[PDB]
Amino acid sequence: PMVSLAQVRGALCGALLGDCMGAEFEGSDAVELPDVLEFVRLLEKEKKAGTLFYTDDTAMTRAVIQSLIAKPDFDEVDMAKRFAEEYKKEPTRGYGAGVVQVFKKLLSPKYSDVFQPAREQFDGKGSYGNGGAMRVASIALAYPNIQDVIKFARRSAQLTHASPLGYNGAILQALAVHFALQGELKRDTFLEQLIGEMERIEGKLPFCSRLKKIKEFLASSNVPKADIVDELGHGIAALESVPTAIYSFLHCMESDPDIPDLYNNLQRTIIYSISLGGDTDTIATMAGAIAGAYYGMDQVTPSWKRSCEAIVETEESAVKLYELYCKQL
Ligand SMILES: Nc1ncnc2c1ncn2[C@@H]1O[C@H](COP(=O)(O)OP(=O)(O)OC[C@H]2NC[C@H](O)[C@@H]2O)[C@@H](O)[C@H]1O
Ligand SMILES: [Mg+2]
Ligand SMILES: [Mg+2]
């Protein structure tokens, strides 16, 4: 039953792998599995370590983690500051065009309410992008109690994503990591857990409807990529990416006929995610966090992880997150 350091480290390294490997295909909407498999074989043979750079997905993840470690009770003012200073330090990591404005406003002296800049986005409608969700995994790694996971997922997201689609996408991604982490649930129970929580939270019900489609897809075999993309999405919008990440994870619990069986489940998850195209760094970073939490560090292979920028720092950070988790027990 008990959550291991291997699982927490697995989640963070999974997220990092997904971001670093997915970034290599970002925004190319048609990705063919053969290119992904070619990329992985080349990657495994690279003599130099650290050839793949992380993006805003990981930059913001690291800022979430530093906030949780500094303020374990969750301090949204501290976290807002870390987001804004990280942006300022490394503004070219690949941030969305909208969210840049949130950081500039948080960096100015005009706002005392750290949630107000996010509220003002897109004529006061707020962002429905997946940026809240891309960084949220660590909430589930720090807070064992589901009510904490839900409220802190929401609040962390609302620093940049004030639209319900934005922040509910973050909650869903946090819940997926939460349920992956706490046991090795069977597929059907995992989805039931998520659908149950999102029905309460949303309750026409956009995320629930996608989770229902996922249930249907998993009851079929040989579902073409095109049907997954058409019905779930591969977009920058949280609605069109978070369920897709969850599907990738659940799908890759079993053999995929197109992916050689010599790849483990976590590797398969990342390969499959990227093969869906679109927002590949974010979909893979989210699917990789879930898979990492589920399968743990045993499936984070040396040849894959050595390729990623900040792998050592990431592995270290897991220990400090794990301490947060254990204190909360
Ligand atoms: N309400 C609304 N209306 C119209 N367009 C929107 C809206 N919300 C988001 N968007 C579009 O989504 C884009 C991204 O949203 P934003 O809030 O700027 O960024 P995120 O943090 O969600 O983006 C995360 C993504 N960017 C790089 C990352 O790896 C993720 O793919 C933004 O520039 C717009 O084109
Ligand atoms: Mg990115
Ligand atoms: Mg992205």
Numbering used by the authors: 8 to 210, 228 to 353
Authors' account:
In order to probe whether the differences between the active sites have an effect on substrate recognition, we used the ADPr analogues adenosine diphosphate (hydroxymethyl)pyrrolidinediol (ADP-HPD) and -monoalcohol (ADP-HPM). These compounds were originally designed as PARG inhibitors and contain pyrrolidine instead of the distal ribose as well as differing in the number of hydroxyl substituents. In order to elucidate further the selectivity of these inhibitors, we performed crystallization experiments with hARH1 and LchARH3 in the presence of these ligands and solved the structures of the hARH1:ADP-HPM, LchARH3:ADP-HPD, and LchARH3:ADP-HPM complexes. In contrast, the orientation of ADP-HPD in the active site is similar to ADPr. The only differences are that the 2″ OH moiety of ADP-HPD is bridging MgI and MgII and a flip of C5″ rotates the pyrrolidine ring slightly away from the Mg2+ ions allowing for a more relaxed conformation. However, the 1″ OH in the LchARH3:ADPr complex appears to take part in the second coordination sphere of MgII, whereas this is not the case in the hARH1:ADPr complex. In the latter, the ADPr takes on a more relaxed conformation, which is mimicked in the LchARH3:Arg-ADPr and :ADP-HPD complexes, thus suggesting that an α-linked oxygen draws the ribose ring closer to the magnesium ion. In our structures, this moiety is either coordinating MgI (ADPr structure) or bridging between the Mg2+ ions (ADP-HPD, Arg-ADPr, and IDPr). In line with the previous results, hARH3 is most efficiently inhibited by ADP-HPD and to a lesser extent by ADPr and ADP-HPM (IC50 of 0.587 μM, 3.2 μM, and 480 μM, respectively). (2) Comparison of the potency of ADP-HPD and -HPM as ARH3 inhibitors as well as our differential scanning fluorimetry (DSF) data suggests that the stabilization of the binuclear metal center could increase the efficiency of inhibitors.
Protein ADP-ribosylation is a highly dynamic post-translational modification. The rapid turnover is achieved, among others, by ADP-(ribosyl)hydrolases (ARHs), an ancient family of enzymes that reverses this modification. Reversal of the bulk of PAR modification is mediated by poly(ADP-ribosyl)glycohydrolase (PARG) converting the polymer chain to a mono(ADP-ribosyl) (MAR) modification (Lin et al., 1997, Slade et al., 2011). For example, linkages to glutamate/aspartate are hydrolyzed by macrodomain proteins (Jankevicius et al., 2013, Rosenthal et al., 2013, Sharifi et al., 2013), whereas linkages to arginine and serine are cleaved by ARH1 and ARH3, respectively, two members of the structurally unrelated (ADP-ribosyl)hydrolases (ARHs) family (Fontana et al., 2017, Moss et al., 1988).
